[PDB]
Ligand binder design. Structure first.
Ligand SMILES: [Zn+2]
Ligand SMILES: [Zn+2]
Lengths: 115, 115
């Protein structure tokens, strides 16, 4: 087994489209109002491994049981990837992650090409 | 918004088949060794909403950031449903849940029929 100590933090990637952008904005405000998070920039186009528009929500491990359960209940149909940050981008995204909603295929090759 | 106070606990459903049953047994032992959990019966065949053999793992909310990150890292390719317990069985499984690995298709109507 590896040790969960090796998790330094998590990212949630909240995916959206034109039809769900407004929902995504409300979820973002909810997160920023409630939790100890760093909100990344809003990407309206796919970038890197990300198959659709998204924004990033970063947090330390002590917010995992705050943010993730909140999103379980309040994501309003949005597909959300949550992954640990362990120093292995490819596994972090492809193996060690979870999904709220319906998983989307990621461009993991983008991450492989970086390593 | 929905209040995560309304989350009384969580279940993990660890799915397996004959090929993966031994990995599932090892994951099960890892859980029972490390965390405050209630391990339910082993179902080799599909039962109720579940489309594959599984076993249940129950825990209080204070284990969510222990159990779930551990499974993130140590599920060894098993598909795992994690759902809250909020007193709404249909929403808990269908809407409020998350998946590690690749999601399976649950029989939600089975739960609706329960009322
Ligand atoms: Zn990320
Ligand atoms: Zn359950």
């Amino acid at each position: 087994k590896e040790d969960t100590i090796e998790i330094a933090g998590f990212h949630a990637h909240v995916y959206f489209d034109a039809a769900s952008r407004d929902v995504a904005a409300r979820v973002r405000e909810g997160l920023g109002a409630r939790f100890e998070v760093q909100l990344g920039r809003w990407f309206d186009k796919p970038i890197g491994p990300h198959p659709k528009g998204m924004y990033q929500v970063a947090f330390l491990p002590n917010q995992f049981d705050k943010v993730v359960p909140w999103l379980m209940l309040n994501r309003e149909g949005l597909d959300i990837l949550v992954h640990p940050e362990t120093g292995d981008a490819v596994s972090d995204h492809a193996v060690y992650s979870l999904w709220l909603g319906a998983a989307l295929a990621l461009n993991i090759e983008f991450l492989r090409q970086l390593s």
